Design a binder for this molecule. Sequence first.
Ligand code: MIX
Length: 263
Amino acid sequence: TPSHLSDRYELGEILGFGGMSEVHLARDLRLHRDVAVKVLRADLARDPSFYLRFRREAQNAAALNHPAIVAVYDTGEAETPAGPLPYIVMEYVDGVTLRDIVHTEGPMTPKRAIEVIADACQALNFSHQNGIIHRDVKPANIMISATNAVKVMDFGIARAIADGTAQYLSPEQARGDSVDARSDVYSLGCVLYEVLTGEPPFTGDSPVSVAYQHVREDPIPPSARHEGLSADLDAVVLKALAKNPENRYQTAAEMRADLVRVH
Ligand SMILES: O=C1c2c(O)ccc(O)c2C(=O)c2c(NCCNCCO)ccc(NCCNCCO)c21
């Protein structure tokens, strides 16, 4: 890919990938600031379905603004020698992902863990509040800023009400049905489990055996996986992870409430 988009954004190294598109650290030359930028593969960008999805991503993202959700500052399409390339300019987050943090620290203190998710809930509730389901909650999509903020990201597959991996899927995603706020709650639960125990709820030889685990197995109570985890907190995690949406928290707000009640 080229080094300068539109004359304005000078792409640097690769921060991560949001499904098949590269996310870059770049510098906005008009505003003297570091910003992160997502660039549709290029091949990808000739397919409508993706062009659309991608345009829609930006608009979905941009159309919500909250300090615990990454901001969008801009989208365009650069006309390069390698053709047209739509992109999205987003608030940069100098930090690490929950993934990374769990992988290097091990689990985090319960105290820490509670607030961190607590925050995630507001973010996600705000999104729901605004008619956006994220559909893709997992450690690799939540960040801790250098200033210790929480930033939820990758509205890559988030759906308005306009109308890969294994272990952070909701059962209804698994069976392949309509998903909603609850599905996000569940995904979030998984993430909570992950952070508290150093371990995800379920693991397998491939996506499919984990998918079944989501649908079939009870989760090991966290306390069992790792001492110094409160009985009160156990039942919290496990509610988010209720197999039936009905038995889950009905919104992020409800979940958060309970979390704040145990911290
Ligand atoms: O920093 C971002 C980032 C950003 O600052 C602004 C917008 C973004 O979309 C990202 C970003 O996506 C990102 C990373 N990608 C996560 C890909 N999702 C996991 C697959 O579903 C993965 C990592 C990542 N930054 C942390 C890099 N530190 C770890 C070693 O470099 C970011």
